[PDB]
Design a binder for this molecule. Structure first.
Ligand SMILES: CCCCC/C=C\C/C=C\CCCCCCCC(=O)O
Ligand SMILES: CCCCC/C=C\C/C=C\CCCCCCCC(=O)O
Ligand SMILES: CCCCCCCCCCCC
Ligand SMILES: CCCCCCCCCCCC
Ligand SMILES: CCCCCCCCCC
Ligand SMILES: CCCCCCCCCC
Ligand SMILES: CCCCCCCCCC
Ligand SMILES: CCCCCCCCCC
Ligand SMILES: CCCCCCCCCC
Ligand SMILES: CCCCCCCCCC
Ligand SMILES: CCCCCCCCCC
Ligand SMILES: CCCCCCCCCC
Ligand SMILES: CCCCCCCC
Ligand SMILES: CCCCCCCC
Ligand SMILES: CCCCCCCC
Ligand SMILES: CCCCCCCC
Ligand SMILES: CCCCCCCC
Ligand SMILES: CCCCCCCC
Ligand SMILES: CCCCCCCC
Ligand SMILES: CCCCCCCC
Ligand SMILES: CCCCCCCC
Ligand SMILES: CCCCCCCC
Ligand SMILES: [K+]
Ligand SMILES: [K+]
Ligand SMILES: [K+]
Ligand SMILES: [K+]
Lengths: 257, 257
């Protein structure tokens, strides 16, 4: 009966959390959306009136451009898709369940292979993350025992603090490189780092997609290393916080009578 | 020493898997990409020649259109963002780490709140999935014991088979709709179902945004229910397959002596 009660309580809390977040986000973003839409409408009217064009022709042209954008054509000199390096980037985003969306299959035959490839690879990546967390806990215990000098296993709180510090340090180090090389601001770099490391992957900001990129040999290697370490650390942090939340739910159930 | 060897072996296998997948995907998609690019170039040249517009003006117009698209403007009629239900959809995609990308924050203040909101919600969702898997295993054991009529826990193989069957059934039932409602093909519907249920979320196909949507009350409820069940089942399947892969790694390590 305890397990069922815990399940039901967690479901109700998640529902309330979703409702509150929806209200807050709407209140934050509605006015900016409306202003942007009005600005676009004014620009489109100005362009249509300037060159004595018609709106149906512009609609057809924009539909063709949407198709071209889906194909991969951009406005500012992007790197080619579906070469060996681009395919490596695509499979890297697929196996980690990030899914930026900058490159997607378009043919029948590529989609079946995507289904089977992902089905086989995602589980292996999850196993890799679990083994990494176990190794990190073991090395932390060994270091603590050696410094004091099995039963020296650290508590959950200290592991959480260490993971938080490591995540912050890695994010700052990665942003310090993303900021100059790209045309991004520091806060935007931190936002991109959080979105990528959590395996959410909105796709609004994607790195290493500018055709000629100076050295271009070390940059891709550094990008790969940074993304891998960030994903591992953030996943471990999520698991530890989930354990703590479960303990809190147990306390809430015990208190209520 | 065994743990370190298993870690190293898994890393090497994943690297080889990535290389092979990259080669196959490139060989599958390069020609289609090139054909699409040539088609777009021909269309753009035709339009520019026809309407006597210079290249730079068209480039500026397309840059403005990209800026407008980033805020939610489309050539077809779509539902507004950030009213109250778009926010519900956005937070639902955020907490489950799907990240379609059809709606993203654009203001300073909405990005910090996103960071903290996701940090707190993703762990709760992971805990919910784990509790669901435990409950499903327990109910399977109880049903098996009752049919035969603790020590009646099923093997991993039977759980994997049951999860596979449930995933296939849910995917087919969900694809029964989305086919006439949005005018998709059946294979495209299955592809979208797999991409969404695995929490990859490319964003090329997104459901339930066409402004007027007939009933629009039951359709959203059904969409929510279907996505929730699919995500739960596919995550459970991933965990079981990871356990099996770990057993296989142990076997091959033992064989190597
Ligand atoms: C060596 C350890 C093996 C484990 C690998 C597991 C998962 C891969 C995870 C993340 C890779 C992120 C994609 C970045 C690729 C960029 C390459 C480029 O910019 O061209
Ligand atoms: C009642 C169980 C509580 C647990 C909820 C946990 C996670 C939510 C997961 C998936 C929902 C994503 C789909 C959002 C669709 C919104 C519906 C619409 O407007 O089209
Ligand atoms: C341009 C870089 C493409 C290849 C980079 C992958 C390097 C991974 C091999 C080292 C880990 C064992
Ligand atoms: C238009 C639909 C918005 C609200 C739908 C959410 C329904 C889930 C709440 C009931 C389950 C506890
Ligand atoms: C005792 C059974 C009560 C039902 C619990 C399930 C509620 C959540 C379903 C999504
Ligand atoms: C006992 C050896 C543990 C190996 C740790 C691997 C390094 C992790 C951070 C790069
Ligand atoms: C151009 C400045 C780039 C600095 C990157 C090095 C950060 C330290 C990593 C250990
Ligand atoms: C222009 C310098 C870009 C590469 C810096 C990263 C060096 C490797 C650090 C691991
Ligand atoms: C003896 C342990 C050497 C470290 C193995 C791990 C190296 C790959 C980590 C990415
Ligand atoms: C003992 C009852 C636990 C609830 C099982 C139902 C989960 C699936 C509902 C769709
Ligand atoms: C037009 C929709 C026909 C299919 C709806 C039935 C879905 C299966 C519900 C169990
Ligand atoms: C036009 C009918 C669309 C809604 C069908 C789904 C009914 C709810 C089934 C759970
Ligand atoms: C905690 C509930 C938030 C208020 C809901 C508003 C619905 C219009
Ligand atoms: C462009 C090919 C690079 C190959 C990397 C080395 C493979 C181990
Ligand atoms: C065009 C045939 C592709 C086959 C995909 C791989 C099947 C497992
Ligand atoms: C170890 C380097 C700390 C991060 C430097 C930040 C510089 C903007
Ligand atoms: C241009 C290739 C760079 C390879 C980096 C070194 C690999 C260990
Ligand atoms: C198993 C595939 C070997 C790597 C192929 C490299 C092709 C450039
Ligand atoms: C429990 C139902 C929440 C209120 C629904 C609001 C729909 C506009
Ligand atoms: C300017 C409003 C910021 C709201 C987010 C604060 C996070 C605790
Ligand atoms: C239980 C319904 C099976 C799926 C029907 C498919 C009809 C196109
Ligand atoms: C239009 C509102 C539909 C609500 C579905 C029933 C909720 C249990
Ligand atoms: K994900
Ligand atoms: K994702
Ligand atoms: K995504
Ligand atoms: K995306």
């Amino acid at each position: 009966n305890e397990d069922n009660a815990r399940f039901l309580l967690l479901a109700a809390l998640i529902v309330l959390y979703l409702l509150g977040g929806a209200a807050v986000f709407s209140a934050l973003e509605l006015a900016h959306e409306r202003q942007a839409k009005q600005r676009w409408e004014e620009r489109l009217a100005q362009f249509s009136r300037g060159h004595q064009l018609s709106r149906d022709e512009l609609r057809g042209f924009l539909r063709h451009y949407e198709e071209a954008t889906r194909a991969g054509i951009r406005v500012d000199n992007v790197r080619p898709r579906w070469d060996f390096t681009g395919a490596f980037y695509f499979v890297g985003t697929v196996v980690s369940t990030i899914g930026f969306g900058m490159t997607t299959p378009a043919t029948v035959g590529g989609k079946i292979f995507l289904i089977f490839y992902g089905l086989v690879g995602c589980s292996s990546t999850i196993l890799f993350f679990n083994l990494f967390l176990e190794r990190l806990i073991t090395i932390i215990a060994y270091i603590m025992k050696s410094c004091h000098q099995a039963g020296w296993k650290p508590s959950v709180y200290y592991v959480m603090l260490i993971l938080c510090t490591a995540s912050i340090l890695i994010s700052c180090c990665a942003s310090a490189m993303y900021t100059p090389i790209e045309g991004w601001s520091y806060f935007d770099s931190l936002y991109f780092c959080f979105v990528a490391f959590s395996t959410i992957g909105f796709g609004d900001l994607v790195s290493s997609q500018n055709a000629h990129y100076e050295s271009q040999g070390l940059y891709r290697f550094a990008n790969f290393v940074f993304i891998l370490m960030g994903v591992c650390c953030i996943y471990s942090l999520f698991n530890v916080i989930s354990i703590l939340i479960k303990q809190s739910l147990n306390w809430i159930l015990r208190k209520m009578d």
